Design a protein around this nucleic acid. Structure first.
Lengths: 64, 348, 394, 94, 130, 353, 97, 64, 130
RNA sequence: CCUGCGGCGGCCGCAGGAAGAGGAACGGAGCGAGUCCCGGGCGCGUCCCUGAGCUGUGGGACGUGCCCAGGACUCGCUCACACAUG
């Protein structure tokens, strides 16, 4: 893959072909992580994502 | 060889350096292995240590004794004993029982030093209760242990949760209090229980049926010994001066009384000859004293292993050695180091 | 000062006092189809609520999933069909669909409709979309100016062949070149699409028009109709983790973060609120007639597509408006809309047609024989009824 | 052998073994796929393979015959097709 | 550069090896690769972690999206296998031998370098809890 | 001085009253209520509850019996059974407050205990990870084996934490957030099994019952006795008023429905909660949700189950908003003023006429 | 008498005080009765089920060993087997639907 | 009994086994004093609790 | 050390013995224990104040929660017994020949130590009321 | 005639309807009883105990007076039969 992005101040993706944003910090891979239907490792991800306060429930809720 | 105190026992080296690792440590007693291979010592740091007979005895200033294992318990050890039938000839028999505060009865293997088995005892609320005394039956098949108004019998072949319960105080009648020590008769089905409620009881091994209940020390009873005579046995207590002698023939009253200084709430051990003739006791004054039980037991000797309480003694089953353990609790005032030692008690 | 404040709390008297002023609500932050619910035009308030349904967000977790959809970020290996099959197996639901087929390598927005929400899949599939993708030019060119010119030239209603075929026409609303690398000749474009537009074909045409030739290197869908990657987007890992967390901890929360109710998709549409007695009739396939209406929005126009909702904010059906907003306000009778797609399951709301005054009068007159057995007039019909009653089936 | 021909369109820059051409067909009618393309001399250069661009000014490309090369063709050169293959634009529009 | 590398770290990338320990780990990886005792990539690493193999698992704190290696550090804790994060993907890749980046490797003991391996093992196990 | 306050500072159920939705602003105030803090002392204690720090020796039943003998009242109930040796937070509801006890017994708990391990482990991290394994919905059996066979059941632990480990004594302090009915003794036993060394519960304290925690408003049995003594001897209410809180403090978390003054006694007699009576209603009222119905002075009339949502209440003009779950207030606290409204008067007239 | 057939019940984890802890592996996450016998692959009784503890999908159990059995005998990931009629479905512990 | 505690700057409880908190103070037992319903010293307790300004009434009112 | 113990005090801790008076009280307690003339623990001290036995009552100033012993000063003031607070319960246990702590000791007068006892009484009553 | 579901962008089959959209007291409350899944603890008071035994902020002996599993589900008695007064 070659597609990379850095967020705006406005909070939305700006795609770029570079490995670094114009302020020098690393751009993220645009594509999601690989998945297979047979992950039994959901427990491990939930544990860690709780410990560092990054589980999706812990973020403030979206506007509905 | 033989045991004979014609003179003061001779010093062979002990262990002093270990116990200093904890400030205000002291030894809670020592016991020879029933084959004489090694000696087990409890301590105020709750670590069961074990020393071999230094081969320097067979092979001058000895080396200081160092233990081969250190079986760490998590809380205060109430009692500990060698397996009744231990031998060096048979590896699997060589294990140590131990009882600790709010822990089960741990079994430790005496060669490797790992935890080997656990016996767990529970009250009516399914809560764990600790054993204040331990004893292996003279046939090795059972592990008797003492509790408050209760003796529970575990089977050594099935470690776990299963025990017979033998109530010693029944509808407020019988032997009350914490049963502090258990002993068996060399000949007879008797076993004898001492209690912190200052009392003795004799029971039937197979039943648990009371045979007698006997007069009091003026303090809670802490140790027992049967003579190689099935006929006669001895007992001591905490904060008593007197060490009492009993007999199964003409029972009901202690035949003789013997004097020793106990002024602490301590188990001051005493021990007999493997042939039964001599009786040796420690004291809080430090003075170890000896009687000849071959009439009233006749005083033989007093000597001072150290200038502190001698709380544990033990006599080697084959060989002339005496072992002593030392120390007591140090009391403060608001604003003298303990040790195991060995002695030769044979002829020159 | 909380010492002072608390002594005041115990010391002195509190009451909610009478006033003569008008009570005006603020519904601007009620959820989904209940937003600005007081600003609707009101026909009547006299009806009986039935307490049988739910507010869409606060549905029980069973019904929440069955009415729900996921704004998924598609992983790069599987096909969209295989993805929705995975999602069906994870959630243990029986039926699933999506908003459009991303060919396997492509990632991005895939609106995965679950169970009863799959009734919306056709409307989601027809919706306009946006893409980000890489074009790999086979030969060098004067620069990004030329690629931008090619993208401008292709911004229109276009001829397209599918990849291997027949000719088709799809429109591309707006195109920009994000940036271009002259070293590898990889250029990244953003295009807004009519649904069904082929981006591989567009890349080939960019190559042809430039003359260098080119391909699509990889592609990402950033928007699928109303949902964007900015907008509540969830990964496959989030779906699986959510279902696992719900199973093991009994914690509904993370599923309720991943799955949304279908009423979120309809939010753009004009609303028309029905009496609870009307709801199950519309679910069974009835016409949407004026006596049922309680509320209606501004700017409802003839043949416009509107969402027909209950008083709890649920969606009953998608519908085609026959009366303008002004006509709805003024008229005595008629059909305000007709069904296009019934969303709500039958017998969620109970069966209460034929119990009202006019319909009971007609129902009685059939038994009296004053109308034919088929309900249409006879010589026995009174002149008053035969004049006044307008049968919508003619 | 061709019965009769009419205009397709006008030359534009070449592509990978291919010619890309600007269609100027009368009233913007559209060719068939695989439609043979002829010169002013009525000799066949190849056949149409791609149709692209926005509807009114749309382009196309030709898979050239093995006898011809893209280097031969020239600016403002016009190309031809039999009118019986041309399709009316209103088949696609609505 | 290390201060700049701390900007790129992902939210779960702790405990993070200190700069001295980071250089030490690079050196240890470079020794271990020569004896073919490293594993690399999440697929291989997790396969052999399931198989029962032990070592020090070194993780790149740069990794985004996090979901790929997230299951690894709890999977370590289930097996009592030590793990540590280091501040870049590219240097971890380079030390492993990969010219392209890498997000996880597993350095295993061998007799040649085990002095440095024991340095790494004790220093990593003596890191603070987050 | 009340006018100085924000509505956010108004006490109990009147807190943030103005951020409720407003149906109407007109009613005729009757005189015969008070703010729950300003109840006359006998009434205050009959409606009140105590957030108690339970002592170590007695059972919770004994504790509540002692409370109802100290305060001279005839009914008491508690938040959840604490085993005799267990200390901590026990909500004790007095007289009319006993109507809320089933709500309290369902509520979530927090505990702080100590587990004694029967053999050594590598350290605190093992115990923490073993606590993580036992989070979620768990199989448990009640803590006695002496009764031959006991049924297995599922209990949920929401969070767990390890606060200390003492390797010398093999003691670890754990904090557990869990649902009511969870057996912590059994948790310690299973934690010991999971480490492999064995275990017991050494000691336990409950630090939260539902909405009440040990942090604030918690008092000792000594406070109850001494407050009753001070009231009896010196006729001073003050120290009782701090020991006992009004039951409205328990209901603060619930969604609110504010009634016209005429509707109150009708509800207390068992009438359903009609929409013409409603003055104000809260965002997020849902169908079949348990809500609290209050008077304009803040007094909880009843626990009601909502038969309308908030938007439905906004749209309609009459009908059942809610049905009674449990009536807190007593009859004729407010006078009978039903049957006097316009439509009901029409119906009365036309039945006679 | 021994049962007719037996189904996979669990893998062997650590011993715990002359008593053995097992991870439970059953195909529908079926849950055993208390004091149900536990067998080897030989349909040979090693003990009985004492404790059940775990997360409802993912749970453990403990075995009280037989009169002559001994915890040292077993090896990690060793399988144990149970009479299928002694199992209960996981649905039975989930609430009234 | 073993549970001790000390206070955090919030005024929250930090539970410990330590007899001293990290700033050097002693820790308090977590458990309240033993109670009897037949206790007769209510007068005495109220008297010196008033005397040293630590009676419950003399504390600031709790915000409700 | 008196300052460190001073930090531990209760709110009711006044009147608090001077450092020298604290030493005097400890040594008097020591002498009285040798004579078997103290009562210690709230249970004994309370019982024998009820029976009316005279003495000096020494209270640990660091006892929490206060409600275990805070009734006692009023029990003394009713009978006009003397009382005083001392900085720690561990020292109060230590002076009584105890390794465990205790929070209250009553020192009864007896012949051998009485000169020091009368000195202690003399100073304790000299103490300012709070 | 309308809707829903299935099968190859229209058709075919099967299933549910034929819908004008009712009801400003419906059918409640409070209290009590019945049917299904006390031997001890605690409190107090004639003497011991800093036990190495929990323990003096409390443990024991001998005396002595307050506490007794929850949840489903049915209906007898009292009071109403309530749309809440611009």
């Amino acid at each position: 893959m070659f597609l990379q992005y850095y967020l705006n101040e406005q909070g939305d993706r700006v795609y770029t072909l570079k490995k670094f944003d114009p302020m020098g910090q690393q751009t993220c891979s645009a594509h999601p992580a690989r998945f297979s239907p047979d992950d039994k490792y959901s427990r491990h991800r939930i544990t860690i994502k709780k410990r560092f306060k990054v589980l999706m429930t812990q973020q403030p809720r979206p506007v509905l | 060889w033989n045991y004979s105190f014609s003179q003061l026992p001779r010093f062979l080296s002990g262990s002093w350096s270990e116990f200093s690792t904890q400030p205000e440590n002291f030894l809670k007693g020592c016991k020879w292995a029933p084959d004489g291979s090694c000696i087990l010592t409890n301590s105020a740091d709750n670590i069961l240590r074990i020393y071999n007979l230094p081969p320097e005895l067979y092979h001058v200033e000895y080396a200081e004794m160092v233990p081969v294992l250190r079986m760490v318990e998590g809380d205060t050890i109430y009692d500990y004993c060698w397996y009744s039938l231990m031998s060096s000839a048979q590896p699997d028999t060589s294990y140590v029982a131990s009882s600790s505060r709010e822990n089960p009865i741990h079994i430790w293997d005496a060669f490797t030093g790992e935890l080997r088995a656990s016996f767990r005892a529970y009250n009516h609320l399914d809560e764990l209760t600790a054993a204040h005394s331990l004893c292996f039956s003279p046939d090795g098949s059972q592990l008797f242990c003492g509790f408050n108004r209760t003796v529970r019998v575990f089977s050594t072949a099935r470690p776990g949760r299963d025990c017979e319960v033998r109530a010693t105080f029944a509808k407020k009648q019988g032997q009350s209090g914490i049963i502090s020590c258990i002993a068996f008769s060399p000949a007879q089905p008797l076993y004898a229980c001492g209690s912190y409620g200052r009392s003795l009881g004799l029971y039937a091994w197979d039943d648990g049926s009371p045979l007698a209940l006997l007069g009091g020390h003026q303090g809670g009873i802490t140790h027992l010994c049967f003579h190689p005579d099935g006929n006669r046995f001895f007992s001591g207590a905490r904060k008593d001066a007197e060490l009492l002698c009993w007999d199964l023939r003409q029972s009901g009253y202690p035949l003789w009384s013997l004097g020793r200084e106990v002024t602490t709430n301590q188990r001051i051990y005493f021990d007999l000859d493997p042939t039964g003739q001599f009786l040796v006791s420690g004291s809080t004054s430090g003075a170890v004293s000896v009687w000849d039980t071959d009439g009233k037991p006749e005083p033989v000797l007093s000597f001072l292993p150290q200038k502190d309480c001698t709380n544990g003694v033990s006599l080697h089953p084959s060989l002339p050695l005496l072992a002593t353990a030392s120390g007591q609790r140090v009391f403060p005032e608001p604003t003298l180091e303990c040790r195991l030692q060995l002695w030769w008690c044979g002829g020159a | 000062p909380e010492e002072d404040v608390a002594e005041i709390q115990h010391a002195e008297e509190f009451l909610i006092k009478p006033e003569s002023k008008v009570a005006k609500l603020d519904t601007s932050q009620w959820p989904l189809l209940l937003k600005n619910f007081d600003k609707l035009n009101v026909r009547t308030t006299h009806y009986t609520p039935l307490a049988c349904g739910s507010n869409p967000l606060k549905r029980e977790i069973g019904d929440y999933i069955r009415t729900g959809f996921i704004n998924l970020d598609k992983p790069s290996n599987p096909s969209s069909h295989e993805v929705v099959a995975w999602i069906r197996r994870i959630l243990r639901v029986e039926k699933t669909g999506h908003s459009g087929t991303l060919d396997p390598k492509v990632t991005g927005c895939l609106i995965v409709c679950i169970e009863r929400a799959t009734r919306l899949v056709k409307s989601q599939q027809s919706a306009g979309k946006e893409y980000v993708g890489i074009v790999r030019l086979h030969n060098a060119i004067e620069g990004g100016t030329q690629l931008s010119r090619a993208l401008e030239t292709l911004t229109g209603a276009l001829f397209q062949r599918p990849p291997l075929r027949q000719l088709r026409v799809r429109t591309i609303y707006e195109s920009k070149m994000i940036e271009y690398d002259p070293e590898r000749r990889l250029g990244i474009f953003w295009v807004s699409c009519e649904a069904g537009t082929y981006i591989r074909t567009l890349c080939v045409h960019l190559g042809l028009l430039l003359g260098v030739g080119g391909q699509m290197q990889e592609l990402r869908r950033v928007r699928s109709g109303v949902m964007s990657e900015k907008d509540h987007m969830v990964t496959m890992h989030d779906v699986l983790d959510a279902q696992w967390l719900y199973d093991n901890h009994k914690d509904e929360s993370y599923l309720r973060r991943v799955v949304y109710p279908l009423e979120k998709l309809l939010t753009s549409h004009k609303r028309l609120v029905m009496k609870d007695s009307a709801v199950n009739a519309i679910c069974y396939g009835a016409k949407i007639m004026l006596p049922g209406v309680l509320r209606y929005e501004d700017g409802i126009e003839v043949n416009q597509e509107i969402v027909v909702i209950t008083t709890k904010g649920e969606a009953i059906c998608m519908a085609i408006a026959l009366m303008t907003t002004a006509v709805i306000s003024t008229c005595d009778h008629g059909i305000v809309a007709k069904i296009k797609r019934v969303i709500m399951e039958r017998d969620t709301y109970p069966r209460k047609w034929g119990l009202g005054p006019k319909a009971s009068q007609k129902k009685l007159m059939i038994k009296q024989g004053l109308l034919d057995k088929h309900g249409k007039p006879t010589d026995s019909t009174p002149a008053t009824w035969k004049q006044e009653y307008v049968d919508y089936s003619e | 052998p061709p019965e009769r021909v009419v205009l397709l369109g006008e030359f534009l820059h070449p592509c990978e073994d291919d010619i890309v051409c600007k269609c100027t067909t009368d009233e913007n009618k559209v060719p068939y796929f695989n439609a043979p393309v002829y010169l002013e001399n009525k000799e066949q250069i190849g056949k149409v393979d791609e149709i692209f661009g926005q509807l009114r000014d749309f382009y196309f490309s030709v898979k050239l015959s093995e006898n011809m090369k893209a280097s031969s063709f020239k600016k403002l050169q016009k190309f031809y097709i039999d009118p019986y293959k041309l399709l009316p634009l209103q088949r696609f529009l609505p | 550069t290390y201060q700049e590398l701390l900007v790129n770290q992902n939210p779960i990338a702790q405990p993070l090896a200190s700069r001295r320990l980071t250089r030490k780990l690079y050196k240890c990886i470079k020794k271990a690769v020569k004896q073919k005792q490293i594993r690399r990539g999440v697929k291989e690493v997790q396969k052999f972690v399931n198989k029962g193999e032990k070592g020090i698992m070194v993780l790149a704190g740069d990794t985004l999206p996090i979901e790929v290696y997230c299951h690894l550090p709890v999977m370590c804790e289930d097996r009592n296998l030590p793990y540590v994060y280091i501040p870049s993907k590219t240097d971890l890749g380079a030390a492993a031998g990969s010219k392209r980046p890498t997000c996880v490797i597993m350095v295993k003991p061998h007799e040649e370098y085990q002095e440095a391996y024991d340095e790494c093992l004790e220093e990593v196990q003596s890191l603070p809890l987050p």
